[PDB]
């Protein structure tokens, strides 16, 4: 109950127009929960782009276990024809529980935490199928029907920890395999930081090579600054005099922490994210009072969409960044902050 599924189906919903096909694999969920998530996918435009693969809690321990592989086989069809697919394996942990049931009923020797030893081989061979293949491999597979196109399969597995304990056998295996993790945690979620992403223990091993240049330029500053703000805020907690570098940092860090909160089912385009980060990294937020920062963002997005939409199209299509782009964004922030109200 920290928003693990919410993040992943919003990632599906946002692909509605990106050209990337989606697969949602449901391992061991209750069928009415699936029926509800499929309904939300159908209230949005997202269901027509999505395959839903199901093995409910009622179904045998072999239908589960095998479901992730059935989903990957469907995702690979797009991967090997020069198309992009996004596959969300939900509760890869439950796949491991079903495989432990099978292994113990087959009387195979238990290993740590009673899982079989090959449980790493179970997940690692599953997850190493998600790959980007070069154009030559596509041409060979398609026998020359498709030429010059690189296909990709992107995997977003989900793991549940029992109490933040990452040292359990199944979490340690899957953390070893993947190209990064997003940690969602209860203390942030109860404090109202939703999505509850912990900036410190979360990391992407691909990093800036995945971003558009505008996001790349702005966001690199954000995440490590925000982590050090949390260290500084602890060391500060009984210091009464605060030096101006420190006072500025703790202020900026609270305003960025407030800025990254976002409502469910409300995805933001590149131009909207870029504009809001440009407000933070150029200090247009700095004077604004903190509860108004939420209303500031809503008013800024509204203002720019009516008045300055040609730039939003330019940024969303290109992802480009230049001195004239910085100038036009500077002009928009200067104009908004004078003329409008939060």
């Amino acid at each position: 109950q920290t928003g693990k599924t919410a993040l992943a189906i919003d990632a599906i919903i946002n692909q509605r127009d990106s050209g990337i096909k989606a697969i949602y694999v449901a391992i061991g969920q209750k069928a009415s929960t699936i029926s509800n998530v499929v309904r939300k996918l159908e209230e949005h435009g997202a269901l027509a782009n999505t395959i839903v693969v199901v093995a409910t809690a009622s179904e045998s321990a072999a239908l589960q276990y095998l479901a992730p592989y059935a989903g990957a086989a469907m995702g690979e069809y797009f991967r090997d024809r020069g198309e992009d697919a996004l596959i969300i394996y939900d509760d890869l942990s439950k796949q491991a529980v079903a495989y432990r049931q099978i292994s113990l009923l087959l009387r195979r020797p238990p290993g740590r935490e009673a899982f079989p030893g090959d449980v790493f081989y179970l997940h690692s061979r599953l997850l190493e199928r998600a790959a980007r293949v070069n154009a030559e491999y596509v041409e060979a597979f398609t026998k020359g029907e498709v030429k010059g196109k690189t296909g990709s399969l992107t995997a977003l597995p989900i793991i549940e920890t029992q109490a933040g304990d990452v040292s359990a056998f199944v979490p340690t295996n899957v953390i070893s395999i993947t190209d990064g993790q997003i940690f969602l945690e209860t203390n942030l979620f109860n404090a109202g930081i939703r999505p509850a992403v912990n900036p410190g223990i979360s990391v992407s091993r691909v990093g800036g090579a995945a971003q558009t240049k505008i996001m790349k330029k702005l966001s690199g500053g954000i995440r490590t600054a925000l982590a050090q703000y949390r260290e500084l805020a602890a060391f500060s907690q009984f210091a009464s005099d605060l030096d101006d570098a420190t006072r500025k940092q703790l202020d900026h860090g609270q305003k960025v922490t407030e800025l990254l909160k976002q409502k469910q089912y409300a995805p933001m385009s590149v131009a909207q994210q870029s504009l809001v980060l440009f407000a933070a990294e150029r200090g247009y937020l700095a004077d604004v009072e903190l509860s108004k920062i939420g209303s500031f963002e809503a008013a800024l997005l509204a203002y720019v969409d009516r008045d300055h939409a040609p730039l939003m199209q330019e940024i969303n299509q290109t992802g480009g960044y230049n001195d004239e782009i910085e100038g036009k964004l500077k002009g928009i922030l200067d104009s908004f902050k004078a003329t409008q109200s939060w």
């Binding site: 602890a234 060391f235 907690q237 009984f238 210091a239 009464s240």
Partner: peptide, 8 residues
Amino acid sequence: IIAILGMD
């Protein structure tokens, strides 16, 4: 020490 008693 700092974290509870403070650096002063």
